[PDB]
Design a protein around this ligand. Sequence first.
Ligand code: QED
Ligand code: FE
Ligand code: NA
Ligand code: NA
Ligand code: NA
Ligand code: NA
Length: 175
Amino acid sequence: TSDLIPAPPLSKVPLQQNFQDNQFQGKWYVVGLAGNAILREDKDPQKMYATIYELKEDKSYNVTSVLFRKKKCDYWIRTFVPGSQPGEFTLGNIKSYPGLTSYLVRVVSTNYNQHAMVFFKKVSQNREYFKITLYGRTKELTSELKENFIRFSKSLGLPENHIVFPVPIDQCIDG
Ligand SMILES: O=C(NCCN(CCNC(=O)c1cccc(=O)n1O)CCNC(=O)c1cccc(=O)n1O)c1cccc(O)c1O
Ligand SMILES: [Fe+3]
Ligand code: NA
Ligand code: NA
Ligand code: NA
Ligand code: NA
């Protein structure tokens, strides 16, 4: 009833050295999206969405994703609590998500003011999902950065049809 490309070993997922949590704050556009549950679709292409990171006093992120769906703005809210090392996080209040037993975030690379690559691994209803997101501070990034994202996604076992580049939009994500 479900087939998934296996999640890579964490050894294949680099960590951004000297992660600066204050500089990673603010709005990021999802210009690239890859994962074992991500599928390319050409009848209904994925629309670009935005994810806003806000550091609280206790140094956990409030993470709000803003999606344009059904002619309305949908808000997906979660909390990233600092993990085993800087640039790694786990999900706050995992009990609120039914079936979710694990959720790991790892910032693979970033220059903070233009681009980032972030790796996610979650175990939900015993199934191990993973995704990589190419974050852009703007809605567009260079071909070099996008090709690097594709290369990295492929290095984690993902084929091309599991790698998408959401189409830029103006609704919801510009506020
Ligand atoms: O199980 C969850 N969601 C399932 C619903 N969708 C599948 C997510 N697909 C992934 O490939 C997947 C794999 C690994 C980690 C991960 O987070 N995600 O999403 C679709 C709806 N998505 C959103 O509503 C959505 C919109 C914007 C950002 C976002 O993360 N999500 O999930 C889930 C639970 C807790 C926290 C999350 O961030 C989740 O995505
Ligand atoms: Fe998610
Ligand atoms: Na299913
Ligand atoms: Na949460
Ligand atoms: Na966890
Ligand atoms: Na391929």
